[PDB]
């Protein structure tokens, strides 16, 4: 496989993508311009919004999605304007998400010209990052059944085999109003002290190996007007994060019965991801010396109910930050990579 | 001394000044009048800002000084007089025009006869507002005073001892950081224990008068989306002191339980006190007046000598629609107030 020119090729196209705004829900332009690249490939394209999919010729076999998103997080030097200095890409969405976006397409056109025993779809979804109903929830019910998928984010081109969930918790408690200097009311404020120590200090039975215990996070607070008004509601938010063995169903039945306030939940539908370490993928990259390990951000796994493994070029700690990069080596490593992973592969 | 001519004469002018608007910090035109007033009586006035004052003929050093004290500044309204049923209606009237009227009538006759103390008349502004131009800007620059009496509707029953007002700011401080990762520091569980300790705490001296010092957590707010660490969390203390302790003294033992920067919005609205055994509290008692403990805040909160609040009418009245003073208190205030300081020997 001509590895330095799938390369060449990943980086003209991310320059591109790098050029063209796409924060969360205002990423028309650059799905147009992603279509009409595919399009000049001799492939057929599929599109849903600013979803835009291409199925592999011969199908209806096992098929594998090859999957990330071409939305982009707001910005914070230099603007969206690509730039390249000894060997780093900067640009917002170059790390995140967009270095897998160009690798799974250079590797998904290449795997088209070769024998498989699988079907191939390649997916660049969108709203990502603001977790959008018009994202890649919008796109499965209509595409074919998906045995097993690949979520492009940067993990150093490590596998991702377990990844925490998502719930936000509105909790709010009701007292009485009041004057403050008199024996009057009932404060909404002293009602959520044992509540909000309970957030803290619970831990649920189940610990995973790769993600510890269930995390709950009270990170937002508001009560009162003025100093002489007994506070008649409390309001507080909880950051939930579930460990691969609990829905956020099952973690929400829990709380109801400890916490007397009314609680609830935003929504349930991100929940935790998980995939058998036998699974032939897994167990392919072991033998090839990858450490599989448990992410804790989530990603557009926690809308697949199929099995997936999160895994693509770049690092964490650049992605929504100031001066984000991607090395051109490391998209030329992913491609190389992704291909041993998947050339042969038997579900 | 003749106690009916006394009262028209307070009547008389306690309804020119209702007819001027004067809500706080904007009592000039009420100040010009009452300073005309006083001249007019063959009086020279002091006056600083809205304040006005006067002192008794002959004064030495010598001799203790009593302050009589009210205030003509008034609320918003809920101002054109109006009487009927034996009652004067308007703005100002109960809280606290029938003060300044009665105590100045006092004030005119006991300067023509000889006593054992000096006197000074004073009536201040921006009171309802415990404003910097009011009492505050006045007090360091007149003579000493032994003790004051401050008139406010009491109903003529005198409040030996007053609450005082400290509103306290407290912010932990944390670290952000991703709520998923192992990151941050968080301002809001930093704050829990010290929430409980403000609701269970109980002071050690408790008064007979006023019970035990106040304390509730009254506003919380940290926060601003979900996924993030919270850095900062501030929330309120409303306190509210018994006479036997200063704010700075509850502020010091605050302080000791508390590790999170705290701030007092001030100090200086202190509770208040007049012994037991001062001659005009024993005075009233031998008349068959009730001394008891006030939980409103007045002018006695800016003064550091000893007084005592005790004004015609009653404190229901006060802030409300439709504002009245019975005639008849009135009377009955300017009486009272001769009985209690003619002859005192201070
Ligand atoms: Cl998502
Ligand atoms: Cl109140
Ligand atoms: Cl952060
Ligand atoms: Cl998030
Ligand atoms: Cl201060
Ligand atoms: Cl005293």
């Known amino acids: 496989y001509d590895i330095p020119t799938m390369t060449a090729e990943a980086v003209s ?13 205002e990423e028309t332009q650059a799905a147009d311009f992603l279509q009409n690249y595919i399009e000049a490939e001799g492939m057929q394209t599929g599109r849903k919004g600013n979803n835009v999919w291409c ?15 071409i939305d982009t997080v ?10 390249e200095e000894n ?18 397409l250079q590797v998904f056109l290449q795997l088209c010209r070769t024998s498989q025993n699988y079907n191939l779809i390649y997916l660049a979804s969108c709203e990502e990052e603001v977790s959008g109903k018009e994202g ?23 596998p991702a085999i377990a990844e925490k969930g998502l719930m936000v918790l509105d909790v709010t408690a009701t007292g009485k109003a009041g004057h403050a200097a008199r024996d009057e009311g009932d404060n909404a404020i002293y009602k959520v002290l044992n509540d909000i120590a309970w957030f803290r200090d619970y831990r649920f039975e189940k610990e995973s190996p790769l993600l510890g215990p269930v995390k709950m996070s009270v990170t937002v607070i508001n009560a009162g007007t003025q100093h002489n008004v007994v506070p008649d509601k409390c309001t507080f ?5 579930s460990n691969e063995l609990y829905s956020n169903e099952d973690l ?61 070029p770049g690092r964490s700690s650049r992605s ?3 001066e984000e990069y991607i090395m051109l080596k490391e998209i030329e490593e992913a491609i190389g990579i992704y291909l041993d992973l998947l050339d042969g592969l038997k579900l």
Not at 13 to 25: E, T, V
Not at 139 to 152: C, E, T, Y
């Open 136 to 158: 890649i929830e919008s796109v499965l019910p209509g595409l074919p059944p998906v045995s097993f998928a690949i979520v492009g984010e940067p993990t150093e081109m490590q």
């Open 74 to 83: 707001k910005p914070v030097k230099d603007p969206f304007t690509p730039r």
């Open 87 to 104: 060997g780093k890409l900067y640009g917002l969405g170059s790390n995140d998400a967009g270095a897998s976006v160009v690798s799974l």
């Open 13 to 25: 196209l991310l320059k591109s993508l790098i050029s063209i705004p796409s924060i969360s829900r």
């Open 252 to 312: 929400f039945a829990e709380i109801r019965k400890h916490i007397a306030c009314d609680a609830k939940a935003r929504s349930f539908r991100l929940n935790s991801s998980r995939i058998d370490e036998k699974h032939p993928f897994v167990q392919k990259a072991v033998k090839m010396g990858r450490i599989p390990f448990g992410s804790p951000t989530l990603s557009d796994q926690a809308l697949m109910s199929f099995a997936s493994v999160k895994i693509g």
């Open 55 to 69: 199925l592999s010729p011969m199908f209806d076999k096992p098929t594998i999605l090859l999957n990330s998103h």
């Open 237 to 241: 938010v909880v950051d939930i994060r």
């Open 320 to 322: 929504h930050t100031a």
